[PDB]
Amino acid sequence: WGKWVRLNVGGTVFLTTRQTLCREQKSFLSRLCQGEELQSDRDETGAYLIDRDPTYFGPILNFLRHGKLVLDKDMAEEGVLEEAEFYNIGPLIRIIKDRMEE
């Protein structure tokens, strides 16, 4: 093993590090790459399998990188929210919600 981790999210593979995923100790991702997830399934390439849409995963992963929420203009904020709720990142869910009143 190493510091690098591959996540197969709905058929698309994302490359990142343990440091990035484990910024939120109670998140699904930190729990995943620490082997504390019961359903830890991996393909032959060693990538973690996630039955979620990869379209809205980029922003989630970027928040874990630089702490900010950045969206392109055409991307639905509702889609990112559903993912943030699934991966259980509190701070991000809040920021998204706070962005959806005005």
Numbering used by the authors: 29 to 130
Paper excerpt:
KCTD17 regulates ciliogenesis by polyubiquitylating trichoplein and its missense mutation is associated with autosomal-dominant myoclonus-dystonia. For instance, the closed pentameric assembly previously observed for KCTD5 was also found in the KCTD17 structure. We also observed higher-order packing in the crystal lattice of the His6-KCTD17 structure resulting in dodecamerization of the core pentameric ring. This assembly establishes an extraordinary T = 1 icosahedral protein shell comprising 60 monomers that enclose a large water-filled cavity. The C-termini of the monomers are pointed outwards from the external surface of the spherical body, making the construct amenable for multivalent display by C-terminal fusion of desired sequences. Overall, the BTB domains displayed a range of affinities from low-to-high nanomolar: KCTD17 (Kd = 7 nM) > KCTD5 (Kd = 55 nM) > SHKBP1 (Kd = 87 nM) > KCTD13 (Kd = 100 nM), KCTD10 (Kd = 460 nM). As expected, the complex of KCTD17 and Cul3 was found to run on SEC with a radius of hydration consistent with the formation of a 5 : 5 KCTD to Cul3 heterodecameric assembly. Analysis of the SAXS data revealed that the scattering curve fit well to that of a structural model built by superposition of each KCTD17 BTB subunit with a homologous BTB domain from the structure of the KLHL11-Cul3 complex. This model placed the Cul3 subunits at the interface between two BTB subunits increasing the overall interaction surface. Homology modelling based on the conservation between KCTD17 and the KLHL11-Cul3 structure suggests that the close proximity of a neighbouring BTB domain in the KCTD17 pentamer can provide an additional Cul3-binding interface that may substitute for the lack of a 3-box.
The human KCTD family contains 25 soluble proteins that share a conserved potassium (K+) Channel Tetramerization Domain (a subtype of ‘BTB domain’) at their N-termini and have variable C-termini. The BTB fold of the Kv and KCTD families has a roughly pyramidal wedge shape and consists of five α-helices and a single β-sheet made from three β-strands. Here, we present novel X-ray crystal structures of the BTB domains of a further five members of the KCTD family and examine the stoichiometry and stability of their multimeric assemblies in solution. Overall, the pyramidal wedge shape of the KCTD family BTB domain creates a versatile scaffold compatible with a range of oligomeric assemblies and geometries that may impact function.
